[PDB]
Each structure stands twice: as C-alpha cells, then as structure tokens.
Design a protein around this ligand. Structure first.
Ligand SMILES: CCCC[P+](CCCC)(CCCC)CCCC
Lengths: 160, 160
C-alpha cells in the first residue's frame, strides 16, 4: 500500500519544515519516501505502508496542518495484490533517436498492460513504469537493452 | 519568452499524436521543448520563443484541440529581461548526506534570489534553478562542486 500527500503554503520555510517531519515519521515506520517541491506545492509519495501506519501518517498530516498553518490533502491506495515500479533513463545528443526509442519502449510496456510516465528535458529522457510484476519488469529491462544497442543511447534502469 | 501548454484527454493515442505535432511546430520555429506525460495530463514547456510564434503555437494548440477532441490550456510569459535555467543532479547511497547537501544547495540559490525546484527519488536528487543570470549560474556551479567533495556525492550540472 502507498500514500500520496500534498502540502501547500506560501511560506517555503514552513513547507520544508513539515517535509522534514513527515518523511522522518514515514521512514520511522520503514517506509520509502519520494518528494517533489514545485512553487508553493509540495508532493510527498510514500510507499510500502499498511493500514496501521497510514492512519498515523494521516494524523501526522493533520497535526502539521495546524502547526505550520498550511493546506494538506492526501489519498490512500490499499488493495492489491501489487504491483511494482521501474525507472528507465535514456540519454543522447540526438533527439530523434531518443523519441524514436521512447515510442518503442512505450509500446512494449503498454503491450504488457503497464502504465508509463515520461519526461523529456534537454538530452535526458526518464521513464517511470508502474503497475507491473517481476515477471514483466525483467522483460522490459531486456527490451531497454535492445534499444540501447539499436539507437546507440546511454541507458540505465532501476527496480524497486 | 517561454510558453507553458497543457493537454488533457482520456485517449493516450490522441494526446501523443498532438504532442508530436506541437513539438515539431515549436522546433520548426527554433524553440527548445520540454514535455511530461502523467496520467491523462500532458505538459509541454516551450522556451526561447517571441510574440510572433507564440501567437502561432497558440493557434496550433486550438487546432489540435478540435482535431483530436482534447482539452487545452496555456500560459504566456513575455516580459524580461531574463532569465536562465540550471539543472543540478545529486546521487549517493546515503540519504542523510543527500538531503544535507540539498539544504546547503538550496540556501545558496535562495540567497542569490533564485527559485528552486527539487525532486528526490531513490538515490537520485535533481534540482532545477530558474530566475538566475550567468553571473549567478557560475557561482552555484562552484558551490555544487564544493558539496561534491564535502559530502562525497556524484554531482552533475547543466546550463541552458
Ligand atoms: C512525481 C515527481 C514529478 C517531478 P518530475 C519527474 C518526472 C518522472 C518521469 C516531472 C516534472 C517536469 C516538469 C521532475 C521534477 C524536476 C526535478
């Protein structure tokens, strides 16, 4: 089970103060965190947490709300069984080769009933593939290595 | 001048079709693009474009709206003079060292009146610094190298 939390406030010092406390509590309960600050909005994505601590982390969210005077919202995903996550990175000085490799890597993951999230910035293209089991994450890694030699691009992948 | 465009639709094939056309037109007018697809929302960030083509790119957005039956919104930033962009990447197997380096890199950029955007995922920490001139982007690169040796982390930075 995972948990998505959003913090909003005009005081950056207050947001980051709340960030420090929230991620500590989540890690205190053996949870892997991921965060992203953009403007006055702070996203905190916590994974590997069951119903027990998700009740506590939510209570911590309400507590930091009143403490630092900021807005807070969250969503909870409990049911299963699954799945998994995968982050692939493409790099190269040829934009056409990257986007062409992107189209193929997308086709593969979506053929195997997986949801993809990609981001192109400069010469780097990052792909997040969620909703896939270990049986699939090994196959996509092979296809990622095929694209590596085919379009001569730098490729890195990490599984969690 | 830059331009922010958002596409929304339940048909992924329609979004990506519109994506291909929009980024071609932007690159056709010597514009550097950046895109991010998440769920049914597609962000397209175009930079290095004046009022002339921003009128055309907007018209292209309205055209793809009716063509693929999708939602479209955009924002335009024209005034100046400036500024610049900077992407710093921290990597390491120690989370405490990364976040401690993050706090310092944040302090430096915000002392020099710069806005920061950071994202922590796994062992990688990426920092986008906007609203800074060449005089500042050289100073932050030096401080990034200081943090590199201090916290023994892998550091990469790119200027645009
Ligand atoms: C959930 C974290 C989302 C942030 P980004 C992660 C992309 C993964 C494919 C996408 C936003 C780009 C404008 C990268 C943030 C900047 C460092």
């Amino acid at each position: 089970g995972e948990m998505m939390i959003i913090f909003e406030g005009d005081d950056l010092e207050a947001l980051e103060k709340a960030l420090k406390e929230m991620i500590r509590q989540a890690r205190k309960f053996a949870g892997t965190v991921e965060y992203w600050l953009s403007g006055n909005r702070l996203m905190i994505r916590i994974t590997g947490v069951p119903e027990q601590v998700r009740k506590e982390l939510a209570k911590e969210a309400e507590r930091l709300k009143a403490e630092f005077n900021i807005q807070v919202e969250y969503q909870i995903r409990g049911s299963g069984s699954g799945s998994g996550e995968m982050m692939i990175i493409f790099e190269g000085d040829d934009l056409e080769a990257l986007e062409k490799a992107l189209k193929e890597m997308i086709r593969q993951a979506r053929k195997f009933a997986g949801t993809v999230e990609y981001w192109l910035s400069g010469n780097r293209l990052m792909i997040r593939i969620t909703g896939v089991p270990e049986q699939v994450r090994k196959e996509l890694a092979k296809e990622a290595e095929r694209l590596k030699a085919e379009f001569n691009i730098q490729v890195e992948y990490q599984i969690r």
